[PDB]
Design a binder for this molecule. Structure first.
Ligand SMILES: Nc1nc2c(ncn2[C@@H]2O[C@H](COP(=O)(O)OP(=O)(O)NP(=O)(O)O)[C@@H](O)[C@H]2O)c(=O)[nH]1
Ligand SMILES: [Mg+2]
Length: 167
């Protein structure tokens, strides 16, 4: 196809859940076991092929530490999509993700597409958030949900592509 589309995506979530790793895996195909916490935000882009359409992603990888919370609107205000990420081995990170979802539903564009990533799924031997419970929560709140692993690549390209398909 010769059609070209571009859209803005923002990643939000508690510090250390794997936002930067998810983006690096999708954009550069890399995974770093020692990834430093993000300061403010980082920007990356990736272009993919989706049904006769070339889709370019402009990605804002936000720093998740609470001291950067007041900067979030600068990154999500014009976003067409968001991926709120939690760590499947940390229930508190899942609760934090729900609060990010609430903030997006109240303050971001009313037409924003929101995905929920249950990341670090490769650590299921330390699971703290039940898959079905998270799926039910996502279904009830109209969120595109997938468990992912930046470490193994499981569902990484899939969640980004699923979002592009629903834009
Ligand atoms: N086992 C595993 N470790 C992961 C996964 N994704 C990220 N990690 C690890 O988790 C740690 C934090 O990841 P990072 O991407 O920096 O998290 P973040 O959400 O960007 N943190 P911040 O918001 O502070 O910038 C790193 O040690 C990274 O290697 C995953 O899918 N599986
Ligand atoms: Mg980061």
């Amino acid at each position: 196809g010769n059609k070209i589309c571009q859209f803005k995506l923002v990643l939000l979530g508690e510090s250390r859940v794997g936002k930067s790793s998810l983006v690096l895996r999708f954009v550069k195909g890399q995974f770093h076991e020692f990834q430093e916490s993000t300061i403010g935000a980082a920007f990356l882009t990736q272009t993919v092929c989706l049904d006769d359409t070339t889709v370019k992603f402009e990605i804002w990888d936000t720093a998740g530490q609470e001291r950067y919370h007041s900067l979030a609107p600068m990154y999500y205000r014009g976003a067409q999509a968001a991926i709120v990420v939690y760590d499947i081995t940390n229930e508190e990170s899942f609760a934090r993700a729900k609060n990010w979802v609430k903030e997006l539903q109240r303050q971001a564009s009313p037409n924003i597409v929101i995905a929920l990533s249950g990341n670090k799924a490769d650590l299921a031997n330390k699971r703290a958030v039940d898959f079905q419970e998270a799926q039910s929560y996502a279904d009830d709140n109209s969120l595109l949900f997938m468990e992912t692993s930046a470490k193994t690549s499981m569902n990484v390209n899939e969640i980004f592509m699923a979002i592009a398909k629903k834009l």
